[PDB]
Write a protein that binds this ligand. Sequence first.
Ligand SMILES: CC[C@H](O)[C@@H](C)[C@H]1O[C@@H]1C[C@@](C)(O)/C=C/C=C(\C)[C@H]1OC(=O)C[C@H](O)CC[C@@](C)(O)[C@@H](OC(=O)N2CCN(C3CCCCCC3)CC2)/C=C/[C@@H]1C
Ligand SMILES: [Zn+2]
Ligand SMILES: [Zn+2]
Ligand SMILES: [Zn+2]
Lengths: 443, 85, 107, 66, 809, 207
Amino acid sequence: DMFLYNLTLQRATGISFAIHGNFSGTKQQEIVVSRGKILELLRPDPNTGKVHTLLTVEVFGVIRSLMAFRLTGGTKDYIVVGSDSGRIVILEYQPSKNMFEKIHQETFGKSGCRRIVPGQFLAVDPKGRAVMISAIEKQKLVYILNRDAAARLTISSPLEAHKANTLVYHVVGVDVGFENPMFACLEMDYEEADNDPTGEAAANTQQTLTFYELDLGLNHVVRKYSEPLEEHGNFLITVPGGSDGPSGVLICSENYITYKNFGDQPDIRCPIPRRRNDLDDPERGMIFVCSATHKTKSMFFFLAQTEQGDIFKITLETDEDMVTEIRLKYFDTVPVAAAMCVLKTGFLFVASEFGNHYLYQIAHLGDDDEEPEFSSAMPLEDTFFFQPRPLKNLVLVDELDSLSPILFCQIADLANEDTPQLYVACGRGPRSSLRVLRHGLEV
Amino acid sequence: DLIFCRKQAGVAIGRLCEKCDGKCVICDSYVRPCTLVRICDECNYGSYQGRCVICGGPGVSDAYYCKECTIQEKDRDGCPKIVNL
Amino acid sequence: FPLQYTPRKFVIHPESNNLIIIETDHNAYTEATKAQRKQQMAEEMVEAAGELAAEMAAAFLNENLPESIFGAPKAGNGQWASVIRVMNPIQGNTLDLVQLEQNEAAF
Amino acid sequence: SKYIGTGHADTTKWEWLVNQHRDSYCSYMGHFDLLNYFAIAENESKARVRFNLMEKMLQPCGPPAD
Amino acid sequence: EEQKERKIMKLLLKIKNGTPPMRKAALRQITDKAREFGAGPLFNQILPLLMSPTLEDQERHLLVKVIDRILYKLDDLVRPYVHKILVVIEPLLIDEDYYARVEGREIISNLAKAAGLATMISTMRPDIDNMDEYVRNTTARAFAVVASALGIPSLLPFLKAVCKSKKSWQARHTGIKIVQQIAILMGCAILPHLRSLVEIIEHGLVDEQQKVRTISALAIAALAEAATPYGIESFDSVLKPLWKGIRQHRGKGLAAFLKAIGYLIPLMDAEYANYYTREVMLILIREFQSPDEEMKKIVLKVVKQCCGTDGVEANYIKTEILPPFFKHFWQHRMALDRRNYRQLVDTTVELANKVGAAEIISRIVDDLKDEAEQYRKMVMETIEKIMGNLGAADIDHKLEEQLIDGILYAFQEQTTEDSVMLNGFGTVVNALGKRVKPYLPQICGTVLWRLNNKSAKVRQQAADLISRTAVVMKTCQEEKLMGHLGVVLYEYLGEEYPEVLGSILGALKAIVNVIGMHKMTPPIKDLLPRLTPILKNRHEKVQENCIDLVGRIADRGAEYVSAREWMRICFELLELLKAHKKAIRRATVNTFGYIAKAIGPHDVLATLLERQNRVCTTVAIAIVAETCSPFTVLPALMNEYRVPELNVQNGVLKSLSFLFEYIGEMGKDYIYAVTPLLEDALMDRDLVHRQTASAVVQHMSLGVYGFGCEDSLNHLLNYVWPNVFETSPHVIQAVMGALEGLRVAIGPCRMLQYCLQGLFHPARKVRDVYWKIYNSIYIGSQDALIAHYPRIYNDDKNTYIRYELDYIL
Amino acid sequence: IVSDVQESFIWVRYKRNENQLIIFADDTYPRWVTTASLLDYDTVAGADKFGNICVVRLPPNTNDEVDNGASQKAEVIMNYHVGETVLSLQKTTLIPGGSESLVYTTLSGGIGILVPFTSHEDHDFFQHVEMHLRSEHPPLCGRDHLSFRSYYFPVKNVIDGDLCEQFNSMEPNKQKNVSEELDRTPPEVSKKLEDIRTRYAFDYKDD
Ligand SMILES: CC[C@H](O)[C@@H](C)[C@H]1O[C@@H]1C[C@@](C)(O)/C=C/C=C(\C)[C@H]1OC(=O)C[C@H](O)CC[C@@](C)(O)[C@@H](OC(=O)N2CCN(C3CCCCCC3)CC2)/C=C/[C@@H]1C
Ligand SMILES: [Zn+2]
Ligand SMILES: [Zn+2]
Ligand SMILES: [Zn+2]
């Protein structure tokens, strides 16, 4: 019996999901990053930018989904977390107790990331009143977040949405105007693809942008509509609806971008532009990786990013309910991020997937440009060819360090002091580097 | 005759008549109960507001699963109400 | 200490106490294929049938974009690259550099 | 029987085989760092890896017999 | 014929009187053929059966959901019949049963989304302006139900279209009745619409009718209850016609005003609640001495909720609000009303949680000395809730003297059974503690005074009172008196009145729990034999109480009593596990553990009479086998095991089942000698051996879980496995759960490696087997199977290699 | 030591007198091996793709001089799911004048170490601390913790560290409940957990 006792010395510093909001309840704003199992809260400095870490907490599990909301009239954002086991939690912050108060749990499925068990994709309504969990199979559950007069969160029964032989690429709910709430999904059938001896249903089968409806009064989930897409789709933004801007989703996909409201809405396409003097293979397309809704009381502009480090300021144009132009305009060139957030007074938190983590202050607002704006209204059969360019808008405030992904570590002494240093070769692509690690006080 | 109902579980808590109080639900154990029991919302209505889950009497006390069915992970299935047919 | 590609493995020199870095990428171009590729594409922009009354190559051969921040010209499916380097950990500077074949990558 | 992945006395090697493929890919998507392994292994981005996996959800092992 | 469709609509009788195949399948018949059938005989046959008042709970739950399931589809054939269905469901919305009310909400909700809104409006047109209060009543609540079905802005232009029309006071009264019933039914989610609804219902506050002032401001109240608690600014125009109406009018509409104002600041800001509280307060003073019960409900609610704002100052509450309050709102005529009893109680309590303790009780100190029973019950509950919420850290000297003089003073004259003096004085002494130094022989001397006599009804309440004053008498530093009523209670062991007898015994338990076992005034060697004959009784109070007394004495003074008497305690407590009370069996198990710690495993034996149930002896073997280490009783069971004979081996297997079932984790070093014992057990002899011994495989397999033991269990597993091909369903079921335990302890890998052999064997009989085991493997923890899949190399037509498991850095 | 990609480590002895490669020991448990660093003549400290650190000892019954893959085996002494991917193991001594420590770095940028003990009394002390700390303080996201480390394999002979180091973070009434449940004062408990880090790892406190 030679038992062993685990311990740790340096926590994992890889950001995978960054949502944000007001968890202090105050005017100030904090960023829930998420590591592999180490949930962590931060705070920027509004005067010199030093991100002072405040709380870090192990969860000993698998963090698979992470969405914040706020109930009607409240001022304290919450967090929902999806688990590896078939139980969903809801958290809440405590500025004096300095911990996460649990609120409520529901039991709906088995443990372990199966197929038919939910917990994979998590849909929240933008009014906080409904929430939906959804696997990559038939089980999709919808909860209702009622608040009583006792200032707590009276959750409801689960709502069944069983449906044999479907897939799901993605689910984000729709900014509807105080109605029976609407949930979007990029389904895909395969029961066609399970009988053909020739096997042509691996072709000729495409996404439907099916919408889902809760019924508050009658306590059942019914489906709204179903319309075929054309090309296969990655992630979707909800366009801010309500009384400011129309209500839709804009489907990023293979080389195109496509608004599609339900209704009598005609659907704009606009292609993603390519760099001047490429040095690549023209076989590979270009899709997106992240999306950042900048909702202001007066207006809104997006900032999404390509594969190759290009932020796009999509300035949406529309009618009261119709849509007019999805015109495009690049913002600048930063290193690659997997999720990022925009903070008030103009902070941008570029959170890379590899290496360091960045934090940019927006120095120049608005549209003050000399390189031309693009459109969908232009006739072209030729895509838009734009210029790559140095850092012009943003400024780098501080460089938050990280070490991931550590590939090959050796512990040895290659100097003339006692302590064995830690030579780690780690990095990604041309950003990789060799790092000397020591352990003393912060010189 | 006696068979489990096996549907989705809500926020409903089961009850037990005091003659059959100490048991578990499925494996009929007695040892180390430390867990809560949820039941469905369709069989919890009307004449059934407080009722023994197993035999059908005036329920005075809750239902617990044994820790054996928790480590075994059987509770995640459908609603465990025995139904006559 | 800065590098070029994704370092797979390295070893210690025992005698002089130095480091032997080997660097390997899938989907990459090496230095020579980048160079003659850029010049050949410059020729392909002279081939566009029009006054060739002014040149883009005067500024186009000037700046190689730093691959540190300006991304990387990713291509191919069976493309490879390989770079081997010696480095001194006391100061910053490098000792020797070896570059290799296009489709032959060090392990 | 109603649970997906239940075998019985007539299920064949193609059915069992494509089942263990499909929940294999759901497990690959299910983790959080094996995707970082595949993204470091062949040089891509994580969204590209996720999309390639989701596209190879209905393709693989081709047409059935007969 | 459609009467033919009534003849096939005897399938309704097949539905209501049905098996789950008749209900599911017949449900699919009519719900798959609804629009095919039609609309007339539907209600002709559904309608009077719904009308029959002898319908039951689950029967009516059938006879609402069936209308839901066939009203999936019909959308426009109800349009002539909306009026008829509404006239039949004129009742069933305001009636007695909550179940009936919510079923009415469901059926008219589903018909409301089923039909068209304009058809609902022009169909429910002639019922706004009838004469009858009851049809405006049920009609306006029907408007609330269909409003909760189709949402708020669908109704808002019609609400504006009625609330301003000058045609009938019945009609305007009806519209505001609709708004209130919408607020009560919907409740929670009318916060963003609330400013709009205020701008509908705001101009009913300056109108000629006392009715419309009444139901209008009353509807403002029943909305702000749903708005509670924010600080919202959607109430702006509401302030002024209320503020005029207070000094303007007098009456039941002023009950409707102050009701609204109480519902209007649980949320408003500190300055607004300050200035407006000062504004209301003078007219409220003016309206204190009004007599009526409703009036005291209202202004008592008003001071409760205007006191509820944190911004209100305790200087103003204490010095300004309270002296007319305690001056005017106390009669000894306050007895019979539970509404103003409990409301006066809760109101003064919620005063005290903000204002303090010693002032509130110090204004009812001299009030204690009364000839009035329910009055003294009221102030008893008052002082007890204040001390139970705030305590005695505020309560001080020159108060406490008259306090204890008050409590013992009224305590001297007490006849009828009340709980507030016992729970009362219990919480009082919970706040007193050691602080009552110079008084205690008066307290306990008065206790003995009430204890000498009085038909046990205050010997029970006083006896309970010792049982909740014991801990102070530990912390008192006086040691003789509790010895004195100690021996007085030591006399007190003979009575045929068991409900009181449990209080004497529980007083004995709380005394013995806290009394110093060194220098016990009583001799326990004569206490315990006088304590023995109680435990052949019938009643659960004295049984549990006396068993617990045995366990506290055994828990503490174990250096005293003869093991002969302990032995008679053991055998006497053996048979008490077969009771029907979980508290009895809880006590019997724990204290049985302590007396089994007193004697132990050594003298006690196993071969106890060819006898019946013996599960109490089995659990006795389990609890002894835990409370000392089973190193004695496991080879002792081996001596009970090594006999070649029938009728015994099954019994010792069952003792193994409850045995490992009980211990689990501490029987990890005691598995080895069980293994050849489980070899002669697990070898192929008999059904009970295979079945129960397989259950022992399961329970052992769950006790060892993550605890450093596998290869033993694999050597078990190789003997477990060939037992699968057996025909009896119970024993194959125990084989199934046996393999599930071997799954969770051994792991998925070795299960699957002993599984894959004959998966594809050409024979259906062995295939049903190996597939069935494979499914039972497969449901449990499929996600662990990812690494443990055997890799199979590819054929010509398809790719079988996951290269994802084969990438190399 | 052969690092087979599906099967586990394979022990090979070479005949210097004969020029022949000999496989004599194997495993029944297929693990997706990445890396290893050895400690002695008989234990092999491996890794995995998914995150299972494993160490297998050679039994001293293994005949060194021989000629599924072998009837003889080598038994597991440890299985401990981490949850990330481990890449470079190296047994060393981090502070001067210290002890042995099997450092695991991992893929997500973290650094983990491992620990040998002193006594069964210390070990059953920490084990009872686990017994009560699990159910008497559950994890945050509701993951059944023994079923989390016991994900693929049954866990064998490891004490978790960070589960047992929440005594610096729980509520003081539960510090009373647990510290008085094991009859020990919280300065004794917290001083005992200071001693491990000041012994092996980078802790800085001066006696
Ligand atoms: C056809 C024939 C009939 O079926 C016939 C057999 C039937 O009529 C008999 C049934 C009959 C009367 O014998 C039933 C006896 C039942 C008992 C004695 C059970 O009583 C209880 O369940 C009461 C309550 O639920 C549990 C009390 C308790 C907690 O002490 C219990 O023992 C335990 O489960 N423990 C106590 C110990 N605790 C710790 C945690 C620490 C470590 C060592 C392990 C245990 C774990 C939980 C008793 C079970 C009795 C079997
Ligand atoms: Zn049910
Ligand atoms: Zn019962
Ligand atoms: Zn159970």
